[PDB]
Amino acid sequence: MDPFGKYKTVVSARAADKTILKKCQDGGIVSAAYIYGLENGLLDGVIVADKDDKLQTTPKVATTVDEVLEAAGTKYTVCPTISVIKSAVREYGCEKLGVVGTPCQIIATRKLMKYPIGFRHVPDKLALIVGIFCMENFPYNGMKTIIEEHCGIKMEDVAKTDIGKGKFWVYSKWGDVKSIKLKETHPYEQQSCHVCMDYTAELADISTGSVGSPDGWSTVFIRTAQGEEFFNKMVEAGALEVKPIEEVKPGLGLVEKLSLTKKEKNAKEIEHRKEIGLPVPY
Amino acid sequence: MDPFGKYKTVVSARAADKTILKKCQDGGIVSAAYIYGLENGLLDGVIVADKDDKLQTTPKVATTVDEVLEAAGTKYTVCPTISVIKSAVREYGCEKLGVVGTPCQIIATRKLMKYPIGFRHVPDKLALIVGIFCMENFPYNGMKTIIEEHCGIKMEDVAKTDIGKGKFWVYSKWGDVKSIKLKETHPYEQQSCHVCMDYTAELADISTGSVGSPDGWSTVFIRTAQGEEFFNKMVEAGALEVKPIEEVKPGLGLVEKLSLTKKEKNAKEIEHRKEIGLPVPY
Amino acid sequence: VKIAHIHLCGCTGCLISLADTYEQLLDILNSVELVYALTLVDEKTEIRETDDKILIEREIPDDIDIALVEGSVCLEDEHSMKDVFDARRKSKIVVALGACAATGGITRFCRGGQMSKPVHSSFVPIGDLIKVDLALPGCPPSPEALVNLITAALNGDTEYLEIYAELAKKTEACGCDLLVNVINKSLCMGCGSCAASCPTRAIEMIDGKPNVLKELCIKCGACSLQCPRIRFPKLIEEIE
Amino acid sequence: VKIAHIHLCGCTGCLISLADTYEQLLDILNSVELVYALTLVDEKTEIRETDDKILIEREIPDDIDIALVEGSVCLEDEHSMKDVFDARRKSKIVVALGACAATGGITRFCRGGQMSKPVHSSFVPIGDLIKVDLALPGCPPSPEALVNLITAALNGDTEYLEIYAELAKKTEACGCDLLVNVINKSLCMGCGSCAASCPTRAIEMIDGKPNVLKELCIKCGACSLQCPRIRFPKLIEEIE
Amino acid sequence: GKIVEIHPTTRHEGHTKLVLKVDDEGIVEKGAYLSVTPVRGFEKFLVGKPAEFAPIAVSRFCGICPVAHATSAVEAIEDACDITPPKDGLLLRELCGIGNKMHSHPLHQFLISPDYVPKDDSNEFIKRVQAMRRIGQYIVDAVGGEAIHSPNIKVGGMAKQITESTKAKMYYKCKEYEKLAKEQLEYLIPIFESRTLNDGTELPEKLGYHDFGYIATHPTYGDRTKIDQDKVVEYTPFDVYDKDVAIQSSTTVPTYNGRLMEVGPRARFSKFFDFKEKGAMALHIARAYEISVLVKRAMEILDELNVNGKTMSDEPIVGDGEKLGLGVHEAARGHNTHQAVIDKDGNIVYYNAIVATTWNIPVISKAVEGTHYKFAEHIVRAYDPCISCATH
Amino acid sequence: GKIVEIHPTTRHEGHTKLVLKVDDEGIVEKGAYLSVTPVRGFEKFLVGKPAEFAPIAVSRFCGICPVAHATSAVEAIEDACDITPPKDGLLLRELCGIGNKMHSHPLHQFLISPDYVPKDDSNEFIKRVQAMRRIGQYIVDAVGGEAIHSPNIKVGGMAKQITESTKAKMYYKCKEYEKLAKEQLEYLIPIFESRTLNDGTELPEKLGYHDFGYIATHPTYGDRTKIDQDKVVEYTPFDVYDKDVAIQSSTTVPTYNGRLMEVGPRARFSKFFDFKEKGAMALHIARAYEISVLVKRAMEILDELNVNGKTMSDEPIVGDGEKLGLGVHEAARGHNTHQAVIDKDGNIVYYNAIVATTWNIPVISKAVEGTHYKFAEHIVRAYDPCISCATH
Ligand SMILES: Cc1cc2nc3c(=O)[nH]c(=O)nc-3n(C[C@H](O)[C@H](O)[C@H](O)COP(=O)(O)OP(=O)(O)OC[C@H]3O[C@@H](n4cnc5c(N)ncnc54)[C@H](O)[C@@H]3O)c2cc1C
Ligand SMILES: Cc1cc2nc3c(=O)[nH]c(=O)nc-3n(C[C@H](O)[C@H](O)[C@H](O)COP(=O)(O)OP(=O)(O)OC[C@H]3O[C@@H](n4cnc5c(N)ncnc54)[C@H](O)[C@@H]3O)c2cc1C
Ligand code: NFU
Ligand code: NFU
Ligand code: SF4
Ligand code: SF4
Ligand code: SF4
Ligand code: SF4
Ligand code: SF4
Ligand code: SF4
Ligand code: SF4
Ligand code: SF4
Ligand code: FES
Ligand SMILES: [Fe+3]
Ligand SMILES: [Fe+3]
């Protein structure tokens, strides 16, 4: 079982702008990439996740850095980022689009490009495809129940959530930090994620994540020639701080264990569905 | 193959009320039965066709005797008579409903009664099923072309269309009578009638038509026990004038020749559709 | 024979339609043995008592002859999955009763997200998981069609049930069935019986042809079943 | 190789889509031989003179390698019925180009009665009469999708075309495909790529799930083909 | 010191669970009645769909009372768009709702008959229930279009007008139903008053007591003015059950002014007919008496009905995309609430439903406390619970 | 004394037939041009369907000019419901229709290139045409959502709006299109004026002459007030062809004051730009000159457009079930007419379409008369016919 798919280099990195770091989940790689492209004419639009005061997510095309800043942080709830990909190249008029999405949404983008039936003049305009790691998603009302009725903190007063370290973590604006075992957070997950076998967004230009890298830092896979040229251009400009993933802890060994834990667990779900007669992607 | 299906007797007959004969096509059998049943409580509602000043038909749940008179006569155009059969037993509140229809619409009625999935509390309320002979139907704009463009009569000035004798006949309100070879009418006929194998309405309680009997009279098949009781009740009440089909000309030999002609012609179409892979009822 | 009413993700309306045989429901219930029906009988009660808990469970019995399975299967609820396979295991004849069990019906529109089970978002007809022997479409099927199915099953009228035994293999339904299989195939003659069969009044006869108001269609299957240019077994031609 | 564009009951939009390869249409036409296309070339001209009349016919030539068949077949028109069987007879590979030829498309709603051919009411995809080898959905499929099919057919890229060769055996499409095969089957994760593929904008993402405005769906099939939880061949995982 | 779990409970609609904490003598100390029926999720897949699809869809909450959800839906959409149904359509709608309650109550008396009706009277008791139900379902067929899921119940009124023939048939059948209602009522009220089952078991005098108020807006139909919907708040099952029980509940927990409330026939009979008895037998008694109230109002409507009056408003379904329309209806089980927000194009942008038994479920949890657990299921059935309704 | 039948005619859209009665020298004495394309029947299946489906469905008349029918459909529904599109939506709509005419005219010049363009110039000529069409299709892509079948064209205006960036792009693309148009026009006008094909054969001076008037309501968009739709009467093929030919025609025969009329570029150029030349060559010349008129008006709309101005009206789609709305638009082939009546619920109760080539088919039948039959097809192509359009 391969753990990461194809990639050129694995890196632990972080954004150089302090504004980004104050607003980002981990190392601010997505926001850093989007803002750099926009500011340097590499991109003219980017798909982002806008969040309502109560953490509801709405897809949006972005043409201003402020917009990118207005939407930095992880909402552990389903946001259809690819639903706006055509709108981006039509009315918005983008020709150098940036797209972000969980590994699945990246899979949708790659198929969307190879068989562009309903995507006339879309594929050529995709200028950078950023993938974020993902283990499991949740319906909004499911995450609402965990945070509010299992963790005490009310959604509005939530400021940052994070899974790992053995369980779920909700960080309150006011200052408290609550944790509940990850074993109780299972009943409320999107069950269509139990057939997903991509952890590190193996088909993105650039994949970025939290695990394997310390707090405030992001594990960054560089996969495609396009992602490499973009990633390098940022480094030569000083938009990123870069350390080898070997020199950093916990390191790639953690990504590998979480990735192959997802794959081995969900591959057994796939075989269970096949066994009882339910459809599985092929 | 068999030409008429099941019947108890076959008789040439016509109504005794001559108001009916003023307004009917052939013998006034359908209207006579409807009006008799309504007047004597055997029927509390009858499905009829409300034609338009341009001969556009409309199905209709008739309840009054005079209504039956406004639908008398043949409109050689499709009229969904069965489409009101539920509305007849719900809001209209009928419990002794009379239904008229071409052999195909009678077939639908018999299936409607044997598999009444969508027909809750409907079968037990059908009191008389009257079928009328039929060889071919037409889309309204097809018949509009036959009458207006091949017979040179505006649908408005149309009075009584009829077929037979080898040609389509248009009788004008202003006196003229035009004839065109049936050959010309065939390109305009509804191509779904070419799979129909029922000429004499073989599944009706009572079936009535023009062919076989003389002008002003009608060939009447009495088929079921329900139709026999209704028919006998009319003859003892004097509503019908009755003569044997053997003493009348052209007689049962024409119906037979026409009924089998349809069967051998369309059975070929059915076998042609099976050959090229199109669906055919079974 | 032993019959049982299994209630999955349904509305009980199919059972109520059977109840709408009225006083003849006692002639039906006396010709068979109602061995299970959570709505009607207290079967099959099994008491397991430990030192901390008394577990009074009503389980689906064994040796069922005919199972009237109503409603669809929720793929994310484990008791729904268990009951549908339990019904196939314990029943000789499995009847997909109603459009929900036969073709999904209204539950085809379910997409989850509602409290208090927001992961409940996937509903399938029982045919997508187990083997179905007979299927009755409609929402609900009329009481008369049910009486006819039950009588034909008890009397071994295999000919009458053929059309239903053929439906058991069909797990999808829509008003489009009339277009795809009839109108588009030069078979429609304009009777309108398909319009009279529709429980939601979604079919409208326009110029001698049906017009489906697709937003008012519950994917029940009654119209596709009624149409005589789809199915027309000789059995129908029998009159007396 | 020899390619031909058969136009049945279509709108020439699929041909225009191919034409929207713009100046690359010369590279495409220069890589093959356009042997028949009523819209573009005067083929195959055959003059038949009797003592009464001169008949100048443009007929479908024999030994066609790839037939891009566009539009549906009218069952009540004999020339339409004849051209579809000729396309199969004379062509080695038949490509159902566009939703009309592949799944019926807009023509599924045809019910006839219009002048000056009021009996024209039954339109079927070419797969309902002839064997189809490849099917391109959408209304119209994108110029980029067409180029890939053409390039893959010239280059014998069997793997790429497998998804389209599998579609050829499917003659019915709807926005309900997403419900019946993804949402109802606990496979939808809410990317929204389907909503972006639709040419009529009939899909609308609501709470991370697709909602199909069924009265705007023209049964084109672009969303069913797009959704990556239906078909996802290993080929797609290939990037550098 | 023991837990008693009954699962599933029987002779009501749907799929529930009793989870009781009982002392060493079997007396319930902490009660838990909860729905475990899967959540089909009507309020969530209706968003994005046209308004006229609501009464068709929400009718499928349940096949016993579908008229109550169609009525509440169209009332909520009419309220959201300021549509006024014409006089005679509103009469037919109320009649259709009354005909539906005319089949539910006898049906429920048939469900509970194995506990209360002697085995020798069973056949004749059932025959009288089905004769009544036929009449109630005939009214729903004629007016609503179908007895199970009435498509005539539409936004703007009722789709079809009946005939003077149909009207007179219903009035005559209502006179016969009233005769059956007196026979039924004179037979059941003495049984319910005896507090003894058909096997001789005496039921405790305080069976099913509780401390909660009632909600009832009308005796036969509904009145949105008689409730302040702002004071109605839905809470989560964690706020009423233990955590290991809460995660299994499928319903929400409605409260009025932060308190549980009972709905249903006794709730109606308390507000409108000065019926003050507590306990579970009072519920069976109120439900039995309401049969006479319903059929007598049905004949009063038919007397008032103009068979030729307009039944559909010509107003268009157009909303402002903000107003939260309120639609209430006294279903057979009690105050049934639907809410809807409609945009300018006639599409649902938000939908919500607080069905009757959704109210009564957390009340049943408390009503079973105080008495032995062998009586818990009899307290449940007194509330005529419909669970597919309470879950939707 | 012979009958010449050409079937199918080529290098136009769709499926037709030329049926000519010629004398011994080949001169056409009686001409007949007729569509034999099956009738998909849009005007008849749209009845019963919602109004927003009309611009989606009628767009499928044709894939060359889909915008023209979408435009005409919503104009007819807006007229029937008294909906007024906002200024900037009406400007984008017109821009979308002009973008479509910006690819149709070069596309037609490409189809007729085998007859007029020398073979050595073919590749460069096709490249210049395709460079022009790419700009035209990009305008329809940006504004309409799709080049082929634009879903933004809606009852009320235009669904989406464009960014100043996009607007600035189209304005620059239009200036380059205007360069290509001058190159194209400086090349083809001399060929058309020489009246000789690329093989050297000279064309008769009176080629394609006829005695009929013209119909055009606007130079670039459409104006329903410039035509009296009551004087438009559709007749049957029996009124223009011989009986054995009439049964084959799929189209109707539109007339204005009971007379055939020509539509198209020369019709517009006659009415608005004082172009008075007759014949078939004048038809190719007017079409070529109209390319500059279109692109100039496109840049004139962009200078006038407010990219943030409202594009969709907020009025609801409600009709009175009687008003026969009129929707006219100057398609690339000529005056295009849609009519529709809408009820209160936004649904189609009657629909009718009189497409441009429907007007020209019976005019073409006469225009081929007088000249040899080997020139008949060249007269057909001068009218740029679209047959799937004329049949709908
Ligand atoms: C449901 C979910 C589960 C995840 N699980 C894991 C995990 O198990 N392990 C792990 O290492 N990482 C996981 N991630 C990713 C992780 O939480 C961070 O988003 C990422 O690792 C670091 O982001 P960043 O700081 O580099 O960029 P940032 O500057 O923080 O910006 C984050 C970007 O992500 C986008 N985004 C936010 N929420 C969503 C969403 N729901 N869907 C699509 N896009 C979104 C926003 O548009 C934003 O631009 C998950 C993310 C999601 C949404
Ligand atoms: C399309 C068509 C084709 C026919 N072809 C033949 C034929 O080939 N040979 C033959 O002998 N007879 C044929 N008939 C029947 C014949 O024309 C007479 O209708 C028949 O004799 C019964 O008329 P009557 O005088 O007995 O009844 P009347 O008293 O005249 O009443 C006639 C009844 O026909 C009903 N009706 C009229 N049009 C339709 C319609 N479109 N659909 C359903 N019901 C309708 C009216 O509602 C009315 O109740 C055909 C009828 C139709 C509609
Ligand atoms: N009565 C009732 Fe339903 Ni089946 C419940 N509970 C509601 O409106
Ligand atoms: N241009 C154009 Fe169409 Ni294809 C034609 N003819 C019209 O409205
Ligand atoms: S686990 Fe897979 S399917 Fe679920 S959200 Fe993450 S990437 Fe998508
Ligand atoms: S020929 Fe057959 S199908 Fe056609 S109208 Fe007559 S009975 Fe019906
Ligand atoms: S088919 Fe209809 S009536 Fe039967 S369970 Fe499903 S929703 Fe209820
Ligand atoms: S059209 Fe009516 S009868 Fe047919 S499937 Fe839909 S709801 Fe059922
Ligand atoms: S039932 Fe069948 S034949 Fe009759 S109108 Fe409906 S689709 Fe046509
Ligand atoms: S698929 Fe669409 S674009 Fe292609 S021929 Fe059919 S209607 Fe025209
Ligand atoms: S929903 Fe859209 S993409 Fe899917 S089949 Fe319908 S029209 Fe085509
Ligand atoms: S493309 Fe497939 S997985 Fe993505 S939102 Fe649509 S149906 Fe769901
Ligand atoms: S199959 Fe999709 S609307 Fe019927
Ligand atoms: Fe609720
Ligand atoms: Fe027309």
What is the distance between the alpha carbons of residues F345 and D215, in angstroms, rounded to a whole number? 14
Report the number of distinct structural domains present in chain A. Answer: 2
Contact of chains E and B by CB distance (3 or more pairs under 8 angstroms)? yes
Q: How many CB atoms lie within 10 A of CB C238?
A: 10
Q: How many CB atoms lie within 10 A of CB B52?
A: 11
Q: How far is CA C208 from CA B57, B199, F164, in A?
A: 9, 20, 52
Of F265, F208, F189, nearest to F379 by C-alpha is F208
Flag whether A158 is in a domain. Answer: yes
* C-chain residue closest to A138, CA distance: C119
Task: Give φ, ψ of B24 to 5 degrees.
Answer: -90, 175
Which residue lies with its CA nearest to atom 3 of ligand 9?
C188
Resolution in units of Å: 3.1
Q: How many CB atoms lie within 10 A of CB B54?
A: 11
Which residue lies with its CA nearest to atom 6 of ligand 12?
D194
What is the distance between the alpha carbons of residues F360 and F215, in angstroms, rounded to a whole number? 11
What is the distance between the alpha carbons of residues A144 and A147, in angstroms, rounded to a whole number? 6
DSSP string, F302-316: HHH--TTS--B----
DSSP string, F245-265: HHTT--S-EEEETTB-EE-SH
My answer on whether omega of the bond before F8 falls inside 30° of 0, hence cis, is yes
Q: Would you say F132 and F102 are in contact if contact means Cβ atoms under 8 Å apart? A: yes
Query: Which tokens belong to D73?
Result: 């077949």
Pocket lining: C28 vs ligand 8, CB cutoff 6 Å: no
Q: Would you say B80 and B59 are in contact if contact means Cβ atoms under 8 Å apart? A: yes
What is the distance between the alpha carbons of residues B38 and B47, in angstroms, rounded to a whole number? 12
- Distance from the Cα of A202 to chain C's closest Cα (Å) equals 27
Of F236, F238, F247, the CB nearest to B187: F247
- With vertex at residue C106, the alpha carbon angle to CA C104 and CA C111, rounded to the nearest 5 degrees, is 90
E289: domain range?
Answer: 2-391
Element (DSSP H or E) covering residue B167 = strand B167-172
Residue E278's SS3 state is coil
Q: Would you say F153 and F67 are in contact if contact means Cβ atoms under 8 Å apart? A: yes
Intra-chain end-to-end CA distance of chain F, in Å: 35
Question: Best mutation site among F15, F16, F61 for ligand 4, i.e. most ligand atoms within 8 A of its Cβ?
Answer: F61
What is the distance between the alpha carbons of residues C167 and C99, in angstroms, rounded to a whole number? 11
Q: Which residues lie closer than 8 Å to F81 by C-beta, 6 or more apart?
A: F51, F155, F315, F317, F318, F319, F323, F325, F342
Q: How do E232-235 and E253-256 pair as beta strands? A: antiparallel
Alpha helices in F227-375 (DSSP H): 243-246, 265-272, 281-304, 356-367
Q: How far is CA C204 from CA B83, B104, C213, C223, in A?
A: 9, 19, 8, 12
Residue found under tokens 């509904």: E222
- CATH number at D75 reads 3.40.50.700
Which residue type does E123 have?
A: N
Pocket lining: B55 vs ligand 2, CB cutoff 6 Å: no
Contact of chains A and B by CB distance (3 or more pairs under 8 angstroms)? no
Q: Let me know whether D39 and D146 are in one domain.
A: yes
Intra-chain end-to-end CA distance of chain B, in Å: 18
What is the distance between the alpha carbons of residues A221 and A263, in angstroms, rounded to a whole number? 18
Domain end residue (candidates: C133, C167, C201): C167
Using the 8-state DSSP alphabet, how is residue F149 labeled?
S
Of A61, A59, A55, nearest to A74 by C-alpha is A55
Flag whether B95 is in a domain. Answer: yes
Flag whether B54 is in a domain. Answer: yes
Residue A186's SS3 state is coil
What is the distance between the alpha carbons of residues E89 and F158, in angstroms, rounded to a whole number? 39
F146/A120 Cβ within 8 A: yes
Q: Which chains are adjacent to chain F, needing at least 3 Cβ pairs under 8 Å?
A: A, B, C, D, E
What is the distance between the alpha carbons of residues F13 and E277, in angstroms, rounded to a whole number? 83
Separation of CA A237 and ligand 1 centre (Å): 25
Alpha helices in C155-233 (DSSP H): 158-167, 176-181, 193-196, 222-226
- CATH number at F206 reads 1.10.645.10
Separation of CA F388 and ligand 4 centre (Å): 9
Query: For chain C, after which residues does the C atom lie more than 2.5 Å from the next written residue's N, i.e. where is it broken?
Result: none
Of E317, E323, E390, E306, nearest to E347 by C-alpha is E317
DSSP string, D55-90: EEEE-PPS-EEEEEEESBEETT-HHHHHHHHHHHHH
Q: Which chains are adjacent to chain A, needing at least 3 Cβ pairs under 8 Å?
A: C, D, E, F
Task: Give φ, ψ of A205 to 5 degrees.
Answer: -60, -55
Flag whether B209 is in a domain. Answer: yes
Domain end residue (candidates: D167, D191, D218): D167
Ligand 10 atom nearest residue D13's Cα: 3
Element (DSSP H or E) covering residue A229 = helix A225-237
Q: How many CB atoms lie within 10 A of CB F111?
A: 18
Pocket lining: C106 vs ligand 7, CB cutoff 6 Å: yes
Handedness of CA D80, D85, D91, D92 (dihedral sign): positive
Q: Would you say A105 and D191 are in contact if contact means Cβ atoms under 8 Å apart? A: yes
Residue found under tokens 């304005």: F171
What is the distance between the alpha carbons of residues E181 and E171, in angstroms, rounded to a whole number? 15
| Whole-number CA gyration radius for chain F | 21
Of F289, F109, F106, F113, nearest to F198 by C-alpha is F113
A85: domain range?
Answer: 9-134+193-276
Task: Give φ, ψ of E326 to 5 degrees.
Answer: -110, 130
Domain end residue (candidates: C149, C167, C185): C167
What is the distance between the alpha carbons of residues E208 and E384, in angstroms, rounded to a whole number? 13
What is the distance between the alpha carbons of residues D209 and E386, in angstroms, rounded to a whole number? 29
Q: Let me know whether C31 and C141 are in one domain.
A: yes
Of D130, D134, D166, D132, nearest to D148 by C-alpha is D134
Of C70, C77, C72, C83, nearest to C116 by C-alpha is C77
Pocket lining: B74 vs ligand 2, CB cutoff 6 Å: yes
Report the number of distinct structural domains present in chain D. Answer: 2
Q: Let me know whether D160 and D180 are in one domain.
A: no
- CATH number at D182 reads 3.30.70.20
What is the distance between the alpha carbons of residues E201 and E204, in angstroms, rounded to a whole number? 10
Of D108, D184, D186, the CB nearest to C184: D108
D208: domain range?
Answer: 176-237
My answer on whether omega of the bond before E55 falls inside 30° of 0, hence cis, is no
Ligand 7 atom nearest residue E60's Cα: 7
| A-chain residues near F145 (CB < 8 A) | 90-91
| Whole-number CA gyration radius for chain C | 19
Q: Let me know whether C78 and C26 are in one domain.
A: yes
Pocket lining: C71 vs ligand 7, CB cutoff 6 Å: yes
Find the length of chain D.
240
Intra-chain end-to-end CA distance of chain D, in Å: 31
Query: Which tokens belong to E25?
Result: 């003598």
Residue C112's SS3 state is coil
Handedness of CA A34, A35, A38, A41 (dihedral sign): negative
Residue found under tokens 């596309």: F107
Q: How do E334-342 and E325-331 pair as beta strands? A: antiparallel
DSSP string, E40-78: --HHHHSTTSBGGGHHHHHGGG-SSSHHHHHHHHHHHHH
Q: Would you say E80 and E319 are in contact if contact means Cβ atoms under 8 Å apart? A: yes
Alpha helices in B92-175 (DSSP H): 103-114, 140-145
Q: Let me know whether D209 and D110 are in one domain.
A: no
What is the distance between the alpha carbons of residues C16 and C5, in angstroms, rounded to a whole number? 12
Of E281, E371, E279, nearest to E4 by C-alpha is E371
Of B61, B280, B31, B215, nearest to B132 by C-alpha is B31
Q: Let me know whether D153 and D40 are in one domain.
A: yes
Task: Give φ, ψ of F328 to 5 degrees.
Answer: -115, 150
Give the burial class of B125: count Cβ atoms within 10 A of its Cβ; 0-12 exposed, 13-18 middle, 19 or more buried: middle
Q: How far is CA E189 from CA D153, E195, E233, in A?
A: 82, 10, 36
Residue A115's SS3 state is coil
Of F103, F98, F76, nearest to F324 by C-alpha is F76
